[PDB]
Amino acid sequence: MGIDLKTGIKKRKVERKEPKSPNPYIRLLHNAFKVVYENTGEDFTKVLTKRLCLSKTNRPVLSVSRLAHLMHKREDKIAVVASTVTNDERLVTIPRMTICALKFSATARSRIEKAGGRCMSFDELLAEKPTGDNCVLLQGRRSCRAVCKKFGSPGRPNSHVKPKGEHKGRRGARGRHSW
Amino acid sequence: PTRIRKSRKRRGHRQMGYGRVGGHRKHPSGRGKAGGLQHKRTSFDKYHPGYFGKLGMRNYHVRRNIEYNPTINIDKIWSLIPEEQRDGFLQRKSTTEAPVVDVTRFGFFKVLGRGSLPQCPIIIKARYFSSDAEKKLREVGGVPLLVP
């Protein structure tokens, strides 16, 4: 009692600590990597566990073409993704690479199996390289959602976003002096 | 399900989350979208530019299948060829047995020029092309054609 605790102190913050998903595979993986980090203190494992706790809206997908373009100076390393890897038909040919992901499309899996690559699961990554030796951690673009592009106030002079519905008039939509 | 709803956790509290001074009344601001230029002017100006007024010419009956116009970019062309034929054609950069693609048979009218092409001759038939689409095609050894 009788103490001042609101003068140089801010309110607490809330962060995720558990995956939140019913899928038992993700719970198992999160717990295993948390144990590994507890017993080694490595940064790769810490970031991996944090990523495994993220929500689906914060885990964008990654294409094979983007993966190829990102492995230009490091073809011998292992690409690690905490999301699904999809196919890119726009790319006629793909090189040989090693990728570890949560999921693969059937087409992406088959394309990687051809060309001599290897598709890896997080279970095998834990079995072989628990601390991520010779591994690169990658993610997609978090601002690519269509919902993200409509945040803000369309009618203000300094915003650069569009209104949400369909608008047919002219008042305030044809320059700074349309009002 | 009603067991897990927020309203069931307000039994015993008298006003159910609507306040004492204000309270829950019927229509304290009006019905629908009324008041857009009067007491709701700030809301409409912040979020809905171009809501009031007219703009452009009017067509009394739009012909919906005349305005239809699908398009394909030059970087999606090779995905129309199945994989086995794909590797066969790519291996031999033949000039006498080049693949012939008719995008109208796949449901497209005009060809646009986003992306790039594999370095191999090809013949593409469409009803229209963009300026750059033709330029990129001829730099890879292909030729464009117009199909009925």
Binding site: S153, K164, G165 | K33, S43, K46, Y47, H48
Partner: peptide, 30 residues
């Protein structure tokens, strides 16, 4: 500040009187 797209649904007609404008599909299997 509420930022929503405006609804484009018509108000109901003939709800307590007049012709019956509600169609149910309980007889689909039959």
């Amino acid at each position: 500040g509420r930022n929503v797209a405006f609804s484009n649904m018509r108000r109901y007609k003939c709800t307590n009187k007049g012709p019956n404008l509600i169609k149910n599909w309980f007889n689909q299997p039959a």
